[PDB]
mmCIF file of C-alpha atoms in Angstrom:
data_model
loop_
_atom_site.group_PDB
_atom_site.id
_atom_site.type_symbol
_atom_site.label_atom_id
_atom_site.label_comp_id
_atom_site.label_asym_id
_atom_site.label_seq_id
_atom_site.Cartn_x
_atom_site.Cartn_y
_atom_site.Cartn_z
ATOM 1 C CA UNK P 1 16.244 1.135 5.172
ATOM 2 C CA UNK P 2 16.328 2.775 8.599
ATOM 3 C CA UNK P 3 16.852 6.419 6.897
ATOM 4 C CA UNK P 4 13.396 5.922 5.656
ATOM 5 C CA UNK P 5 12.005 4.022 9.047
ATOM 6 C CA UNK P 6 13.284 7.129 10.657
ATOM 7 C CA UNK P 7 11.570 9.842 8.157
ATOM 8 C CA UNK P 8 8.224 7.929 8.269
ATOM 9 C CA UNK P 9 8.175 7.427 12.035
ATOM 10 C CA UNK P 10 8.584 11.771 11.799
ATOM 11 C CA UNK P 11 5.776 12.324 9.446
ATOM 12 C CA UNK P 12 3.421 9.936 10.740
ATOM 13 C CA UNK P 13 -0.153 10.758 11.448
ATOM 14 C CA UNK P 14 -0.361 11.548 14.860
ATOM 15 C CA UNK P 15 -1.622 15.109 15.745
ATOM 16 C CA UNK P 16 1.947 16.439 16.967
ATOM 17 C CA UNK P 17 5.318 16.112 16.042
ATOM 18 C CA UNK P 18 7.842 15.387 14.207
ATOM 19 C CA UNK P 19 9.513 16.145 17.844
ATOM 20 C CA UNK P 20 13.357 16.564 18.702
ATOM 21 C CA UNK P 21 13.906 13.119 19.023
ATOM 22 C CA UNK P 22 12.444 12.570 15.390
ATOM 23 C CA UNK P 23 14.326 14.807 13.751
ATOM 24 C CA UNK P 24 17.751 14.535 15.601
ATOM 25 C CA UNK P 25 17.149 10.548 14.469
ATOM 26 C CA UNK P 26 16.312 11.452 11.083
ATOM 27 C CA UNK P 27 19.414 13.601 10.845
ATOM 28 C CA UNK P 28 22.115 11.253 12.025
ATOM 29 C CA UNK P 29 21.172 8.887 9.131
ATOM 30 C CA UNK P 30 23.730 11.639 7.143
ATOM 31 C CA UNK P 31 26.474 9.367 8.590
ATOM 32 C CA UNK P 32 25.896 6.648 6.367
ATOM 33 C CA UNK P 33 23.118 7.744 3.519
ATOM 34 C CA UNK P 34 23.872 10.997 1.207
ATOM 35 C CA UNK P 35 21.332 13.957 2.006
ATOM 36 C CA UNK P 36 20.431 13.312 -1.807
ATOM 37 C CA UNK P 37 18.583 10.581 -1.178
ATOM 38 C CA UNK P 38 16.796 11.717 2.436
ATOM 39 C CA UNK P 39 15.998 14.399 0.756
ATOM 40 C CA UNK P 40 14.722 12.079 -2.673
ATOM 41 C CA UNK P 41 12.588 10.052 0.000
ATOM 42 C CA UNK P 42 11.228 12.217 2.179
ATOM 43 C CA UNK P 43 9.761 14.154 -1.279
ATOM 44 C CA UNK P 44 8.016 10.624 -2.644
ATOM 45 C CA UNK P 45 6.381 10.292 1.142
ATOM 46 C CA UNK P 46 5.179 14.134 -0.035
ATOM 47 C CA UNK P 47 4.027 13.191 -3.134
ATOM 48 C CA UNK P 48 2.738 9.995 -2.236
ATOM 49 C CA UNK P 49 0.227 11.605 0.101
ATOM 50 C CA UNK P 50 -1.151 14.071 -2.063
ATOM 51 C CA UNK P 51 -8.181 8.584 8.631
ATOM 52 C CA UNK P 52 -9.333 11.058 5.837
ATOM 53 C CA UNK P 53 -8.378 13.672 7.974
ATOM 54 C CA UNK P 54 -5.147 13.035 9.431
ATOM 55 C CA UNK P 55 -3.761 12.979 5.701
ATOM 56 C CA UNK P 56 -2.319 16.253 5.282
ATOM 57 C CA UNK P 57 -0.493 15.794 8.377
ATOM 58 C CA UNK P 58 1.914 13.633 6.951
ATOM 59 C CA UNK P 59 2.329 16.557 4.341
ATOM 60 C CA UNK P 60 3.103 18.752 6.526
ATOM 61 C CA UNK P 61 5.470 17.080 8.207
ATOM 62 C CA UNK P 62 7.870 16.202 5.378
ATOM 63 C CA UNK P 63 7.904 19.859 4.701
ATOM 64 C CA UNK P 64 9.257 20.304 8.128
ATOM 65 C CA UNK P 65 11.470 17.712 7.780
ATOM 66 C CA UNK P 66 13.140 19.367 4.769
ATOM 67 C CA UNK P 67 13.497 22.803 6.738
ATOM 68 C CA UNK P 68 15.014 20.984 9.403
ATOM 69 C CA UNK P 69 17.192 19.495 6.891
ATOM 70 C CA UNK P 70 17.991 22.676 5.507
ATOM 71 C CA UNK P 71 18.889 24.407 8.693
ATOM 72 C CA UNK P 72 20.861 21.645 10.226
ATOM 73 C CA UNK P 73 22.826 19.671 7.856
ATOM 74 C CA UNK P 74 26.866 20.777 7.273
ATOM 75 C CA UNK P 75 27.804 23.297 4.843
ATOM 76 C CA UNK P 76 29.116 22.024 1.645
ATOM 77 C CA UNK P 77 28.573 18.210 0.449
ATOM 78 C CA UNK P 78 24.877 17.569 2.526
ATOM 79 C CA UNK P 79 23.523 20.944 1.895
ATOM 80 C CA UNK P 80 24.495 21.456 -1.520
ATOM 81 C CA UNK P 81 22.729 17.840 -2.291
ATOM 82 C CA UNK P 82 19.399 18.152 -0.377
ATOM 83 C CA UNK P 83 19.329 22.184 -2.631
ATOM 84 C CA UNK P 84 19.896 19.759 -5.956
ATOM 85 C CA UNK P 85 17.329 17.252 -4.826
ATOM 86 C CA UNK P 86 14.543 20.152 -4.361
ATOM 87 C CA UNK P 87 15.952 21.672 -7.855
ATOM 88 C CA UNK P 88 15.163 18.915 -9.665
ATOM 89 C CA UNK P 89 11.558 18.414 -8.126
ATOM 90 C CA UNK P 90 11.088 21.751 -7.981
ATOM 91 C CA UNK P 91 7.914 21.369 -8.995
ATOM 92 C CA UNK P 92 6.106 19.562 -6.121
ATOM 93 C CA UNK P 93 6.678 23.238 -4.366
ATOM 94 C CA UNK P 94 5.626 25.297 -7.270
ATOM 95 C CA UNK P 95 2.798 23.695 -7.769
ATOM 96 C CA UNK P 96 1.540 20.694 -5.786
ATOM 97 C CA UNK P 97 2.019 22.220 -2.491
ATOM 98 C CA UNK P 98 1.493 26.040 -3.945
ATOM 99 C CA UNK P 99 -2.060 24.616 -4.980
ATOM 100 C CA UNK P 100 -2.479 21.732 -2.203
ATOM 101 C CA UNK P 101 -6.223 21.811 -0.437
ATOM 102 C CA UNK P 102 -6.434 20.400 3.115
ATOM 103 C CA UNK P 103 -10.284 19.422 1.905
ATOM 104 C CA UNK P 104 -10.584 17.767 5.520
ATOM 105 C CA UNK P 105 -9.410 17.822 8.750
ATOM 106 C CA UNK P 106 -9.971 15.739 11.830
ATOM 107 C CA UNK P 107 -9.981 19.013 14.073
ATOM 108 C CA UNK P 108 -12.096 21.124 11.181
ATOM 109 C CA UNK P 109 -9.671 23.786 10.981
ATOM 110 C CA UNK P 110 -8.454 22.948 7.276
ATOM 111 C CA UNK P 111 -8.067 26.338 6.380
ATOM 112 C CA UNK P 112 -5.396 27.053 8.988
ATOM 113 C CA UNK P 113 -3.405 23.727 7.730
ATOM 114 C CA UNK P 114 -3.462 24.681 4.090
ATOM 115 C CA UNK P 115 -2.296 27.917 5.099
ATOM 116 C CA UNK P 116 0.479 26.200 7.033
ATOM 117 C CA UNK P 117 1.488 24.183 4.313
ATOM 118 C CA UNK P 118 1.892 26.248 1.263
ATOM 119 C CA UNK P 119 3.428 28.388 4.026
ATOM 120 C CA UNK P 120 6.333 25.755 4.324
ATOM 121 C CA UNK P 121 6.580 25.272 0.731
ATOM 122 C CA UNK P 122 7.020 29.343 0.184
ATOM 123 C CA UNK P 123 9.549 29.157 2.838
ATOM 124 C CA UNK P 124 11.431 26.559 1.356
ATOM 125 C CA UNK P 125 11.425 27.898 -1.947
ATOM 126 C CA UNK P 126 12.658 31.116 -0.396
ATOM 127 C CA UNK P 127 15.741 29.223 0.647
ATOM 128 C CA UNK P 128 16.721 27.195 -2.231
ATOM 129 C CA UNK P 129 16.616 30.699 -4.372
ATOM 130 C CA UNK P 130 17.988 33.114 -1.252
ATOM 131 C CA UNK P 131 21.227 30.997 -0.059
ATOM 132 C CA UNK P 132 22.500 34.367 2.164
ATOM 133 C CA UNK P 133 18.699 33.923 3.560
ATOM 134 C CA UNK P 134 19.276 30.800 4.284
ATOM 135 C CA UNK P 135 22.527 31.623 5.734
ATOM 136 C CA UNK P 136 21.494 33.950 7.877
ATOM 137 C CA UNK P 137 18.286 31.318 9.251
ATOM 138 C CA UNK P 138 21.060 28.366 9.462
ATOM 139 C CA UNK P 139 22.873 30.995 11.736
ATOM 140 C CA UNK P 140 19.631 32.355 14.069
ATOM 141 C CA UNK P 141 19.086 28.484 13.980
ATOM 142 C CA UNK P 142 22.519 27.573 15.164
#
């Protein structure tokens, strides 16, 4: 489906991104596909993925993909599905990204990367049990 085309193409392997354009793509999919099941995909790319060393990127990048999500969708319907979706797999934060190990990276900084991806998870996690912190980052966000 092009929901998942678009949240591939923004945690692919290349050594930036996802940019704007990704995620503004990725987000307009909420037209036609609940934010359950964005949310539901974007989790199995996660999983799924945990070049040897341009792996973790694509874990990274779904994380970021879910905090954009987070900070961007409406209030109500899309947010309160993509908060059920984590719920339920609450566990890939708690403990597959918690405990993920960036064992190699193409650049050799694999500590930084593991750092900034149980980073991401925390955060996350920080929103789906906060909602007034969440609040107030949808609002600095705009």
């Amino acid at each position: 489906e092009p929901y998942q085309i678009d949240i591939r193409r923004a945690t692919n392997t290349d050594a930036w991104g996802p940019t704007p354009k990704h995620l503004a793509k990725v987000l307009r999919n909420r037209y036609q596909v609940p934010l359950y099941l964005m949310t539901e995909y974007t989790l199995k790319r996660l999983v799924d993925h945990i070049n040897y060393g341009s792996e973790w990127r694509v874990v990274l990048k779904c994380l970021v993909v879910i905090e954009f999500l987070l900070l961007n969708v409406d209030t109500g319907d899309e947010l309160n599905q993509i908060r059920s979706c984590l719920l339920t797999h609450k566990h890939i934060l708690t403990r597959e990204i918690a405990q993920f190990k960036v064992k190699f990276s193409n650049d050799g900084k694999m500590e930084i990367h593991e750092r900034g991806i149980r980073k991401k998870g925390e955060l996350i996690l920080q929103y789906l049990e906060d909602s007034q912190f969440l609040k107030k980052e949808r609002a600095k966000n705009k």
